[PDB]
Amino acid sequence: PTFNQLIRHGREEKRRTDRTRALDKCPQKTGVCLRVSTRTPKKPNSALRKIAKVRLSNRHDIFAYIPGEGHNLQEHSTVLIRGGRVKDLPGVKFHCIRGVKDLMGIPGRRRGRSKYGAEKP
Amino acid sequence: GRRILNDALRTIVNAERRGKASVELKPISTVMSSFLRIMKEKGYIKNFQVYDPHRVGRITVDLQGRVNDCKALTYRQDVRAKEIEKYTERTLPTRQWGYVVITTPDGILDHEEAIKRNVGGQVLGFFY
Amino acid sequence: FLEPEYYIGSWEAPSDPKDAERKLAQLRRDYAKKVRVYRKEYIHEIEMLRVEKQRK
Amino acid sequence: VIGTVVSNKMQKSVVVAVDRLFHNKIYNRYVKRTSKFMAHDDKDACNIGDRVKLDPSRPLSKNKHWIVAEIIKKARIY
Amino acid sequence: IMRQRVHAILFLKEDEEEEERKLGRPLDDSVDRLLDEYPEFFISHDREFHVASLNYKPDFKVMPEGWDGTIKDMDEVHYEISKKEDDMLYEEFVRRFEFNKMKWRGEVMCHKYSRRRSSEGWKITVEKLGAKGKRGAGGGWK
Amino acid sequence: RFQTCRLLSGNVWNRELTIIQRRILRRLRNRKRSIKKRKIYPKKYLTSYIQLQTTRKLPFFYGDLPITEMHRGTKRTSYIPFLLNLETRFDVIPLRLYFLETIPQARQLISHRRVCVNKGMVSITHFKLSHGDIISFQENNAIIRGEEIRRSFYKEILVEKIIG
Amino acid sequence: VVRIRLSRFGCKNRPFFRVMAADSRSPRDGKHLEVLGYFNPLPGQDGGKRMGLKFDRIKYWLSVGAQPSDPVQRLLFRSGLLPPPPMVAMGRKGGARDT
RNA sequence: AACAGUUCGGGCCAAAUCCUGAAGAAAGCUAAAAAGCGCUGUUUGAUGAGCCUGCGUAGUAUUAGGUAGUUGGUUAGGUAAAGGCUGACCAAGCCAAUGAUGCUUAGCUGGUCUUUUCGGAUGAUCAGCCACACUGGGACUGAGACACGGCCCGGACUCCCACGGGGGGCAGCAGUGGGGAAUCUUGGACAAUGGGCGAAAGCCGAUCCAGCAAUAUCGCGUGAGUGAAGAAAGGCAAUGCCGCUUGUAAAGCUCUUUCGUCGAGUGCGCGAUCAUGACAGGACUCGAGGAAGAAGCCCCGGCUAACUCCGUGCCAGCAGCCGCGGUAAAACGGGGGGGGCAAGUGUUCUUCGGAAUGACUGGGCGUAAAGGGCACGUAGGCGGUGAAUCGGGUUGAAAGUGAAAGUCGCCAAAA
């Protein structure tokens, strides 16, 4: 508005909410997997997707997807959690990094081996 | 800066781009007379005959037809002599031209006369 | 450019068995009085400069 | 330095008000802000509404480290 | 030619003669013997600073109606700045080539002796200096 | 490498073009370089296509340093680090401009061998030198590269041109 | 006691001292009154030697009474303004060179 | 820096420059009675401290009243120094819509990242300052503390004890256990700079070096050159043109051996200083001397440089966004091939830009979000002329200061 109004008022910024709510700004927070549930993606995409409900070390419990085909995860498997959100399945905003801690990366992948925790075949 | 000043300048500009050639402004002033003259001998107008030196108020300005946007400032601000080299970069054609008009204790200047005499004052107007 | 140039010898400290008091006397009186003299000079000359500035 | 009195009932501790400019270049306006001073004044003599000059001094109270001076423009009171 | 070019011509032919003496009457001049003018462009400068100015910032300055003055020429004001650059160029290259010549016989490696201290600096009026020498005081000189 | 010429759709100065390389360059150069560069008028960012082609030509010219990175080091666009590295990078620029192959032939030379400047060895491989700098080989460099520069200035400027 | 002294001022393994009028109980690099020029302790190539000092104010601070430390006398005599160090007694014997 | 003096008792088992009285203020010592030191006072100067103060210095009104030493005044103390610092008594003020009081976040500054600029994010390393020292509470000495390895008190917590009591404080350096996503060696040396006492010889994990970390930087290297038998294999193909290509690539072969590896040899310079080397199995120069010791990741549906074969069939799965998968998937997976970067790459987190997407520079509010139902009026902003005066703002000039490091220009050394 007028400068006088601007001098006596804040001209405050625009507010948006960052979706990620890991307890801290830390890149990954480790956690233990409570239950492993396969869920169906929102339409049009149609399939079964493997996700694990994980309680982070901060004690907040967040659903985390496992990327790649094949999971050795069982109840209480400790898996480092990164922040990655899949669009098709709503409510899952976290990813599990393969090849670290407990979840074991897929050895077979030969392209993109760095992700999926694969040593060189 | 006043608002009768802004008024005189905008009436000039609007009469110009409307296409008339001779206009009259009722509420007159010394800082406005000085400014009409400054525009004149810098080229932008043709005659600026003020009528009543005191107590009444009337100017008749007859105009050429040059560009003349010339907004007349309202909110005062200082101008030193060595700050114009950067401040007159915030006119319309930042580089080439327009004369930021400055007021001094030694008479109302433009920015050329100012940076020559090394005097300061306060900004009043623009030129484009 | 209006600066001098000359030479100094302050050697021959150890001469006789176990009597360093030679160079010790050197140190004490020589060096102290040296520096003190220099300092006096400085005081007077700099206050000279000051009074020049006042006359200015 | 200059200022105007606002309150008086203090028994040698007359309090005046003085303003200045909190000019913030950023938004480029001359704005006004005040800071209400207090000044010792013997011979207690002032009326709310009449300006005064001041001058600094060593501490004189928990506040009130000013000193009054001449009464500029003493104003009438109905 | 360019002045410093000429200078290096002097130096190079000179020490080449000095090593002619050394290596005896065998003198190479093999590739130099080429004086057919197809395999070469070798564009050499006689003037300097003719490709483009130091800048061409579009900026102006208006003179009033009764200017009662005479304008200047642009090709003419050019080459004045070229002459400034040219003089500075000669000075700087002279100094650098000079020190390189005086450097043809010096020490830049891991060995020195380092007992002089080069008394210097006033930091308000420093146009005078001096040195020290080795364990002798010296001074006032240089 | 010739593969890079094939990519650049032209001739990046591979040496000793064997016979099928002759064939493939004639094919590629004429057919492809024509058809693309001749009459297309694509929206295919011809400006940016050109940009890729030039920023890919230049690095081989100066060996293998990334020149987009040179651009980026300063906040300018170009022409300044150009005039600069060409004022000297001291092996790739001058040694080739006079007598060598700018490639790791003229490189690694400053790494192990010597070319003393003002009789001073400067073995950094990226020096900038201007305004009064004497460039000199060593003698055990001379006793071979005098003959090498002769066989260059003649076998590669007289002989090859004349058989051409 | 203003101790006109020399504080380190440079990269590791190749330092560069600097002359500043300090206070005694101030840190080595601490709050200085003012630097007084410099003293590069490295041997050079133009004149393969060392350089550095300033004048015209060390007079004033000596006059007002600074007691400095002898690693500064090693310069404030080598450039005058002082007497030599009263510990210039002797010299190691047997320096040998062959280059 | 200068000026004046350092006399006597006495007490401390023994005596002191220890204490304590007198005068004047103290105190005398000598390197076999020796000068030269000291100590006290007068007078200055410097450094520094203490105190006080103008101005600038978070958000929050879904926190509107707060405060009785409160606000002033006198009087005594007070303090080294003014003062509600204070007791007493006196008078009732003071702060608040310029947001007081509350409530939440936090050490501040030079500055680091980004941005042309403004701004915004940060205050870690390095320095200015304040605060803080297991938790609370005090105070003593002393120029100089309420003092981190000074004292006393309480608490809380540990550790030994003979059992009574003692003892304990890493938020100094390195080092353990804890929590984490994770942040170093229980190194060396005063060798130098810097501080301390010593007239002088002499003592320090500050510091200077060293140590592990692709933690970032900048580099420099993993070769030069041939090299068609287009090798074999590798793919793809109607399976044209060496079918295409890997591929001059390899292989071979001749140079080259820096960085690094091995062995020699020191006032070179870091103490070049009288001398003082930890660094230092460093460099320095010389030599054995083989390409031999050194190439990886990401991407190839479009955005966006780059593509093909097979597997795969709404399953598996990728997606930063738009979306691909229902037997021809260039998007999933495998084989080959190629682009981008390169000792580094890729993902996530983190902050700015793009983002004019809080618009001062740099917006809008008729139909798109947004003109209050309307006015009144408080501050508040802003708002006629000509004449005069003053000189607060304004503006011209000088000095002081605006720590140094930083940004930046130049210059030079440095790689």
From Swiss-Prot, chain A:
The keyword Ribonucleoprotein applies. GO terms for cellular component: mitochondrion; ribosome; small ribosomal subunit. One of its GO terms (biological process) is translation. It is found in: Mitochondrion. It holds the Pfam family Ribosom_S12_S23. GO terms for molecular function: structural constituent of ribosome. Keywords: Mitochondrion, Ribonucleoprotein, Ribosomal protein. InterPro entries: NA-bd_OB-fold, Ribosomal_uS12, Ribosomal_uS12_bac. Belongs to the universal ribosomal protein uS12 family. Protein S12 is involved in the translation initiation step. Component of the mitochondrial ribosome small subunit. A stretch of 270 kb of the mitochondrial genome is duplicated within the centromere of chromosome 2 resulting in the duplication of the gene. The expression of this duplicated gene (At2g07675) is not demonstrated. It is also probably not RNA edited and therefore differs in all the positions known to be edited. HAMAP family: Ribosomal_uS12_B. This is Small ribosomal subunit protein uS12m. It comes from Arabidopsis thaliana (Mouse-ear cress).
Swiss-Prot record, chain B:
It is found in: Mitochondrion. One of its GO terms (biological process) is translation. Pfam families: Ribosomal_S8 (PF00410). One of its GO terms (molecular function) is structural constituent of ribosome. Its main location: mitochondrion. Keywords: Mitochondrion, Ribonucleoprotein, Ribosomal protein. It comes from the Eukaryota. Gene3D superfamilies: 3.30.1370.30, 3.30.1490.10. NCBIfam families: PRK04034.1. This is Small ribosomal subunit protein uS8my.
From Swiss-Prot, chain E:
This is Small ribosomal subunit protein mS75. It is found in: Mitochondrion. It comes from the Eukaryota. It comes from Arabidopsis thaliana. Disruption phenotype: Irregular structure and reduced number of cristae in female gametic mitochondria. Completely disrupted male gametophyte functioning (shortened pollen tubes leading to altered style penetration) and impaired female gametes final maturation of the egg and central cells (persistent antipodal cells in embryo sacs, as well as small and short egg cells), not required for double fertilization, but essential for embryogenesis initiation and endosperm development, thus leading to the presence of aborted seeds in siliques. Essential for fertility (male and female gametophyte functions and development). Required for the integrity of female gametic mitochondria. Modulates male gametophyte functions, including pollen tube growth and style penetration. Involved in mitochondrial-driven cell-to-cell communication in embryo sacs during female gametes maturation (including embryogenesis initiation and endosperm development), especially for reciprocal signaling between central and egg cells which regulates reciprocal development. Component of the mitochondrial ribosome small subunit. Expressed at high levels in reproductive organs and, at lower levels, ubiquitously. Coiled coil: none annotated.
UniProtKB/Swiss-Prot annotation, chain F:
Residues 88-162 form the S4 RNA-binding domain. It is found in: Mitochondrion. A stretch of 270 kb of the mitochondrial genome is duplicated within the centromere of chromosome 2 resulting in the duplication of the gene. The expression of this duplicated gene (At2g07734) is not demonstrated. It is also probably not RNA edited and therefore differs in all the positions known to be edited. Belongs to the universal ribosomal protein uS4 family. Component of the mitochondrial ribosome small subunit. This is Small ribosomal subunit protein uS4m. The chain holds residues 18 to 181 of 362 of the full protein.
